Amino acid sequence: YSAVSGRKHIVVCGHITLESVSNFLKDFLHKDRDDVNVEIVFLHNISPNLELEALFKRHFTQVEFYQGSVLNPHDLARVKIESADACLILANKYCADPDAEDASNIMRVISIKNYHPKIRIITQMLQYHNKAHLLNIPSWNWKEGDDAICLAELKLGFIAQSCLAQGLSTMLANLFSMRSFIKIEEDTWQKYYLEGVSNEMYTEYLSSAFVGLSFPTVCELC
């Protein structure tokens, strides 16, 4: 790859396959989001097959590929991590033996940390018991620029937090998929439901004029 001034590029590594790439890319480049200005770079050690070539070509201006590994500190020099911004890690959810998958992910994090300490990392995990080991590696900074997203924890968390009130699971889970508003005219429930499906959750700084007021009052004002 090459580095171009004025922009930013990220990296991915892990279980690269048609389903995962389609879902991730769909969520990443969806038009509803704020004006996006990034590029996407993949790595893998199996030459992608014909079917996936379709997706990697169709976004000829936003996706680039480089065969290699992630454990070889020459490959991780090709991709130019030393000027990147993050490195996500797709992890295989439907594995046979859970333990091997997260072990391999652990070692991947280890190597990427080995090449550079000041990097950002966002990954997946499969059981809370093994999540803790990642707390140990020397440069993870939970306080600054780092994080980790499990599945089992979030799964049971959604279910439990919905135990107190029906359906809360769906209401949460729909807030984190980018969707656009739709037209339905038949007087079914589908129209009234899609009415609220396409909502999302965003963040922004406030205005200086609202400092000296009351949270209920400012909520009502908003």
């Binding site: 707390l135 107190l164 009130a165 009234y192 609220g196 909520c219």
Partner: protein, 111 residues
């Protein structure tokens, strides 16, 4: 909170100790709650049909912050029936009708 995370990793088990004044205050964290319609003071606006009318008065005097509507699956048809499944609509506009039988997702302030 980071504090629990650290203890969680170190002892491999949650642990507790005699309570202290600071620990007692800690529990002001708010909770997820569901609220019925046909009873309670809010039932005065049972057929109000304006989610905004509920929204303004809810938190103004109770910090009762509402964002979700939960509705019977056959609640709109003319013909009556008895199915008892319900769907969810999030953050309705200001002028959405409200049948006398519905549920409100909400956040309850204190303990």
């Amino acid at each position: 909170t980071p504090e629990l995370e650290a203890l969680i990793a170190e002892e491999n088990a949650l642990r507790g100790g005699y309570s202290t004044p600071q620990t007692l205050a800690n529990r002001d964290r708010c909770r997820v709650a569901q609220l019925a319609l046909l009873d309670g003071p809010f039932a005065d606006l049972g057929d109000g049909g304006c989610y905004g009318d509920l929204f303004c008065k809810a938190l103004k005097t109770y910090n009762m912050l509402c964002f979700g509507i939960y509705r019977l699956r056959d609640a709109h048809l003319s013909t009556p029936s008895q199915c008892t499944k319900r769907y969810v609509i999030t953050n309705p506009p200001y002028e959405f009708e409200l049948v006398p039988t519905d549920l409100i997702f909400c956040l309850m302030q204190f303990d």
